[PDB]
Amino acid sequence: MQALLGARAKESLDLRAHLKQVKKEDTEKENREVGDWRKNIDALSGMEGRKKKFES
Amino acid sequence: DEDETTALVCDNGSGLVKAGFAGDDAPRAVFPSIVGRPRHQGVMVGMGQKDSYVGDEAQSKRGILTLKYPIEHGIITNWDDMEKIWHHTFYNELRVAPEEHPTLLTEAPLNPKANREKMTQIMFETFNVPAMYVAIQAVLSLYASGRTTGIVLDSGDGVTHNVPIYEGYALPHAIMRLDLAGRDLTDYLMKILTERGYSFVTTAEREIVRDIKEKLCYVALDFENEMATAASSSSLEKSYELPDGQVITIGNERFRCPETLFQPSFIGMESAGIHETTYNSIMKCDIDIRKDLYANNVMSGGTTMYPGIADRMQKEITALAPSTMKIKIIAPPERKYSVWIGGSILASLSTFQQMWITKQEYDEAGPSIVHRKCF
Amino acid sequence: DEDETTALVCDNGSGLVKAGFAGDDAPRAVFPSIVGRPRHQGVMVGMGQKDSYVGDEAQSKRGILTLKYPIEHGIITNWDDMEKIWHHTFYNELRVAPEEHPTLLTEAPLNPKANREKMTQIMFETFNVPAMYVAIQAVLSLYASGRTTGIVLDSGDGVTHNVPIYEGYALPHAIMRLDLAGRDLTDYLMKILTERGYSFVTTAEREIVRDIKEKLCYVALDFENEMATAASSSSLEKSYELPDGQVITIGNERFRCPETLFQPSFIGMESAGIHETTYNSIMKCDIDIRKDLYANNVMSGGTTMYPGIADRMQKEITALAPSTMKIKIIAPPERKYSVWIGGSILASLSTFQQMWITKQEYDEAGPSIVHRKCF
Amino acid sequence: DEDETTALVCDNGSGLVKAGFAGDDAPRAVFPSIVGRPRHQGVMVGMGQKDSYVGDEAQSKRGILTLKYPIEHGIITNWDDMEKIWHHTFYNELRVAPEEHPTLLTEAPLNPKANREKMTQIMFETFNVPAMYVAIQAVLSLYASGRTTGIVLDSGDGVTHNVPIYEGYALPHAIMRLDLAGRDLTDYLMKILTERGYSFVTTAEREIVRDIKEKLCYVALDFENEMATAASSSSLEKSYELPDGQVITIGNERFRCPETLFQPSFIGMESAGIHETTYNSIMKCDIDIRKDLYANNVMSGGTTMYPGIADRMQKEITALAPSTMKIKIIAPPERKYSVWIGGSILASLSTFQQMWITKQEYDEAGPSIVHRKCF
Amino acid sequence: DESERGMKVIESRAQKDEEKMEIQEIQLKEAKHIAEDADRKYEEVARKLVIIESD
Numbered sequence A: 001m002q003a004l005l006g007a008r009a010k011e012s013l014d015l016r017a018h019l020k021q022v023k024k025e026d027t028e029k030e031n032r033e034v035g036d037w038r039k040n041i042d043a044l045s046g047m048e049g050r051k052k053k054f055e056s
Numbered sequence B, C, D: 001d002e003d004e005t006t007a008l009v010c011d012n013g014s015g016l017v018k019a020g021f022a023g024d025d026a027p028r029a030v031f032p033s034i035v036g037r038p039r040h041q042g043v044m045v046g047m048g049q050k051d052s053y054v055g056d057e058a059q060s061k062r063g064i065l066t067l068k069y070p071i072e073h074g075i076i077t078n079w080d081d082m083e084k085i086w087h088h089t090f091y092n093e094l095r096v097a098p099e100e101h102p103t104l105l106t107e108a109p110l111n112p113k114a115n116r117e118k119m120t121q122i123m124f125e126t127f128n129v130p131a132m133y134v135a136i137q138a139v140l141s142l143y144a145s146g147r148t149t150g151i152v153l154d155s156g157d158g159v160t161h162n163v164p165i166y167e168g169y170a171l172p173h174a175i176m177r178l179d180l181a182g183r184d185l186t187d188y189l190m191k192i193l194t195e196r197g198y199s200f201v202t203t204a205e206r207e208i209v210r211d212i213k214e215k216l217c218y219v220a221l222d223f224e225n226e227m228a229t230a231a232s233s234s235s236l237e238k239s240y241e242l243p244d245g246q247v248i249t250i251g252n253e254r255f256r257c258p259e260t261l262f263q264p265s266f267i268g269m270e271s272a273g274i275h276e277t278t279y280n281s282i283m284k285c286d287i288d289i290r291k292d293l294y295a296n297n298v299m300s301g302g303t304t305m306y307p308g309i310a311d312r313m314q315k316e317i318t319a320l321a322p323s324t325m326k327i328k329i330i331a332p333p334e335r336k337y338s339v340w341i342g343g344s345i346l347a348s349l350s351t352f353q354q355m356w357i358t359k360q361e362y363d364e365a366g367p368s369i370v371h372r373k374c375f
Numbered sequence E: 001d002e003s004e005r006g007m008k009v010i011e012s013r014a015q016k017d018e019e020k021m022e023i024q025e026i027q028l029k030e031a032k033h034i035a036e037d038a039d040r041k042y043e044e045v046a047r048k049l050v051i052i053e054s055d
Ligand SMILES: Nc1ncnc2c1ncn2[C@@H]1O[C@H](COP(=O)(O)OP(=O)(O)O)[C@@H](O)[C@H]1O
Pocket: B011, B012, B013, B014, B015, B016, B017, B018, B154, B155, B156, B157, B158, B182, B183, B210, B213, B214, B215, B300, B301, B302, B303, B304, B305, B306, B336, B337, B339
């Protein structure tokens, strides 16, 4: 009498687990573009004088 | 230079263009779909200055540029500018020439044929990509969401697609493609802000309004109660900082603009709105397929970030829907980026490696091949 | 899964297949006589999806499938789909391999000969069954009911057989097979519900109308008096839940459809009804037979479960029958399944173990042998 | 305009209402089943204007109106709008009205009965008709066609009925009703024209694509050969003039729209097409009927104006039909008008003068009287 | 999400049990209907048994 509710609840879980496993495998396999970068600055602390350009 | 020749993945919308490589969970970079051109006479010499700017360059130097968008309502009308965008997107920024990698592009399933054909043609003839596959955007939204069944309503900048998919199959007779989108919400906001005393008409002004919308606007799940107060009191207004230090406040207009997705008449459009099109995508399917589509309204694309859109899209459908039935909105964090993410997922499937147009089949058949091999 | 090397029993109608093992009082499972196939274009890659669905699989995924029935009006024509249903029936749910078990199948004696020949051939050539036997549904009904004598009305999905049996003997000249069955009652209901405003045309819709009939319909003891009130008041209406949350409310149609059993003209058939067939099967037999057949009218199969049917049939036959004589109906709770039980009884009788076609006699003669060996 | 109390006849579909008076062999005028309403805010005053527009007014001022159709698949869902259309039809343009004339309505045999009940109530209580009759569209087609026998494909705007009639009698068990009609063919066309770059969404656009279908489309006797050339050559293309001076060039879409009649799967319908449907209406009738129905395939209603339909239908039925038998098709110039024309014939026949419901019987019984007095 | 997945299995389980309960509730009203109907029939036939036995 319960054989089908077991089987039906399982079919739903197996499909949901499949679909989530597919997106999770890519989420976990590669993760660099999903991260961040230093984005550093210039400051010009070595600028002890004027440049060679006529504009400086 | 790469570990494997996986596909490059890029979602080209009417708003943003996003790209990265297949197998990751994010694009490396996002660009506006823009090619910019100077609208002024140069006077100083040796200032660098390009004849045309692409993507973020176009937006960054926009102070003296007129900015054009090559994509409108989901299709490419200016392929030359998309060629510039793809070069920048794939080679200048991801640092990968398409010549050595398959490329996965995207388009809606009822997207005019010329666009899926042109995307196939340019990547094969100007970039020499070894393979092509133009993805169904709804499919990618489902891949990113972890669903096989549901209505994909992608409310992007270009077009709202409204497609019912059941067990991985489309129900095409029930697709309600609608020419109501995020780009119209931006122009409506420029006009309503003009009514408030803050006129916006130029490219710079449009980019400001798009920034205002993205930070200040919302849908409101119950707009009648929300406007009764927002239109009556300053306590519901939110301030926005403009590039020159000016401050604009927006009240009921803050949600009235997004409200157009439910009230299309605000922009002169004849439409039922996105909640009724979701309803009809469900209702026009057979009764043994609607009980699953009602329980799976799949939100995707951009504009989905407005607070109240998911609840506003579930309440309206529930009101149109039969009683007893459970109506459910799925609105994951992979919003706006779900198509790109799904693209990455599709590209990495082992079964998808049999779906590619090779740069052999392409030349034998020509670009019309996209309809024989992709969709 | 099973603890004995017993015979297998499968009663295959145009509706459903009842299958289990000989010695039980129920099929292990009931498999609809259906092979389903997708009628829509697929869009997602790597999400499984079968090319065809069999039996319960066909109904479970029916939202996008067209469902075909291999058996029509009592016989098998799509032998290929029958083999698939049987493979599933035997190996996945009954958990048996027919190669190790003799098998009993059924038909109506006034069905075309090809049916018994193809059923026999499939079990001997694709299943390698050691033995076969095609049974008479009326015989099985009499064994299940504890009788050797009576008129059996087996209510098929395809046809109704109507056969008199006396002291274990056939009286074939008095068989009144009628082209009226459960699938015709279903078609009538689809048309009558159309008159009420509910259109049911597609496979999912056709399956619903069958389900409506099964839950809401009855025949009534007195049609005209029942219609006099059913046609006048909501007090005799019943609502059925459609699988989308909507309902259909049905009034006198609730009995006008089953009434076709007494009035076949409702579906264009030239017949006076199931009580005429019962009556003539008795009347065409000798007068020293008739007394035992009048006292033993046997209800078997479906439709025998309708309110008013056992009482109505006894009333309808006693009305045609002579006075003094006792007219009686046998209608056990083992409704819609007693023929399966009869299959189990016959398959396991010691008196029947000499009735089998062996996989020696079959291989030497071919499938035409069933005509000489079974009945 | 008229000097006698002749019956009036109206053929009311989801397309247009054909109307005129009995005794004529054509409607006097055609009244689109349309109520138009402005979708814009008025700015000028002293502009006349209507609150709502009907029929031809609705189409003439359509540039700023949304146009709605009160009838869906043969059922009036909005009868307040039909009363406005009818008032105009009768009092402004035909110059006749039920008030001084008996009225005949045309309907399908399985049209939901409640729909006749409401039309009956309206003509008796709103238009004060002295008498009514609701006639079968197939009957009307047979009178107009000079026949008492045949399969009538009444090709409506929202539904096709398909009913066999023999010697003046209905053969209802062989009705093969199909949810496919001229309005669905339009939907397929607009979707394929959308693929070519010409979306049709809003009201003006919806009316244009319907007009394109009526003037450019055809079925042809052989679809695949017609496509082998139409899909390969510009010589099969036709440019249609759009209202603003622009044109749309259409290729094989010109026949793919009409083809849905033979291929309903084009719009998601689970059907084999109108020739299979016609075939079954003939084939399900007794064999001594079949010969007369094969000799009398009657095309009526709309969509039968498509070039090649007489040949496409006769050849497909001949292919499905038994050999030796002669399959014939009736496709008179009285096409699309033959239902209205039959209404004129029937209303005026001397044999029909006692078939009218009077406005005596009507008030004693109420609107439900149509269910007992007409059919 | 894992907690919802757990929850959806147990929500689905609650639903499977709600469905089974409802099916069983129907089977109960029917099992009891029959208990009563079989007793109703018992009395109809048993009454006939008494009448017929008296006869
Ligand atoms: N913070 C935000 N708030 C509201 N809307 C947003 C936000 N971010 C993105 N959107 C809107 O979504 C649209 C982008 O469309 P999109 O779906 O991302 O196209 P694509 O599928 O190619 O990625 C733009 O109109 C943008 O303004």
